[PDB]
């Protein structure tokens, strides 16, 4: 069964440079060794979900090398949105740790949005929980049109963040594929 929600915060965290790191040779076992590192990265991100401060974070899935998660699925009515931003900071710490031991410099590119979504399972194959909506689409666009080491949020999401004590800097108006001109902001770290 599908259930509607009014205020769910979605987040897409990408690693744009991974695709370039990935190569297939006889030395790296046809790219297996590269995937071995991706597995270590996802694992360190997945381990943050066990921290008491992140108990309200639900990992939906992982698209390629992008991490997708949401808060507010178990419903200062807005604190969960602020929590999502706290989780995006923690991923950076984890990726910085990986970089330290793998002699790389991978950087995360985040996009966060909030609004109504539909949650449940779809299709006829396997019971895989997921969330749909225009809110989820825009969250993803905030990632794909984002900047390395930045968290790009939408206008209303930015307003909510400010009430919570967050500084935001206007990125300007950008033409988002399918939505048109949208004013967006960068969260200040």
């Amino acid at each position: 069964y599908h259930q509607s929600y009014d205020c769910v915060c979605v987040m897409f965290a990408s690693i744009p440079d991974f695709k370039e790191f990935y190569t297939e040779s006889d030395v790296n076992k046809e790219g297996l060794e590269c995937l071995r590192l991706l597995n270590e990265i996802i694992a360190d991100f997945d381990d943050l979900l066990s921290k008491p401060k992140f108990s309200g974070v639900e990992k939906i899935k992982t698209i390629g090398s992008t991490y997708m998660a949401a808060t507010g699925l178990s419903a200062r009515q807005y604190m969960h949105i602020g929590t999502m931003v706290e989780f995006a900071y923690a991923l950076v710490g984890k990726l910085d740790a990986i970089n330290k031991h793998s002699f790389n410099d991978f950087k995360l590119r985040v996009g966060i949005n909030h609004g109504p979504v539909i949650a449940g399972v779809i299709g006829a194959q396997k019971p895989q929980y997921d969330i749909w909506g225009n809110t989820v689409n825009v969250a993803s666009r905030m990632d794909s049109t984002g900047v390395l080491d930045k968290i790009q949020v939408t206008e209303e999401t930015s307003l909510i963040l400010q009430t919570l004590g967050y500084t935001c800097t206007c990125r300007g108006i950008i033409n988002v594929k399918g939505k048109g001109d949208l004013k967006t902001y960068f969260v200040n770290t």
């Binding site: 509607s4 995937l35 597995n39 270590e40 996802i42 997945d46 539909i118 299709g123 997921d130 939505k179």
Partner: protein, 189 residues
């Protein structure tokens, strides 16, 4: 062992099919979250059924992107044909859902054949997936496809054994990845 146990296995001689909705972000901006989900579930449930009938293993659904592979788990020399037949049934199903729903749904289909790595990554929320340059190519074949048609590569055509009539794909002129990689594409009739 200092590296997490990786649950990944390599597989040669397999086919990969990608399908994606045209203008899904534009569509989700018009109808209620319910409609989008009902329409999307009506479509993917059928695909999932068509997948089993064609010996195709559905991988995962990324919003509007649907994909599956043939030759997995167990080897099958009939692989290329399965994905081609899968595309055939898929394109037809999209038309029925377009009629009884009224929603403007159109999908591009892409196919490529080669080796893949498959299994799962991380610790939490496992989901079967595939990774390899060949899989990456299949993804671009979809992007470089045409609304309501099956876009295939020469690699895939060589496994078809000449059972389908194709025509020049010209994918190079529709997608930058296909050109830079010198890929010869075709379009099944």
């Amino acid at each position: 062992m200092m590296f997490h146990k990786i649950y990944i296995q390599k597989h040669d001689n397999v086919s990969i099919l990608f399908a994606d909705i045209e203008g899904f972000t534009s569509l989700a901006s018009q109808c209620t979250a319910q409609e989008l989900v009902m329409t999307l579930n009506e479509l993917f449930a059928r695909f999932d059924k068509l997948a089993a009938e064609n010996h195709c293993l559905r991988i995962k659904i990324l919003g509007d992107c649907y994909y599956c592979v043939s030759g997995l788990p167990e080897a099958r020399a009939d692989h290329a044909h399965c994905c081609v037949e899968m595309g055939m049934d898929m394109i037809e199903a999209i038309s029925l859902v377009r009629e009884m729903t009224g929603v403007n749904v159109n999908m591009r289909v892409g196919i490529h054949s080669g080796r893949v790595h498959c299994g799962v990554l991380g610790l939490r929320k496992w989901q079967f997936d595939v990774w390899s340059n060949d899989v990456t190519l299949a993804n671009h074949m979809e992007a470089g496809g045409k609304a309501g048609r099956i876009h295939i590569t020469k690699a895939t055509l060589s496994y078809l054994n000449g059972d389908y009539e194709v025509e020049p794909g010209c994918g190079g002129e529709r997608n930058a990845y296909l050109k830079e990689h010198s890929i010869e594409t075709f379009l099944i009739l």
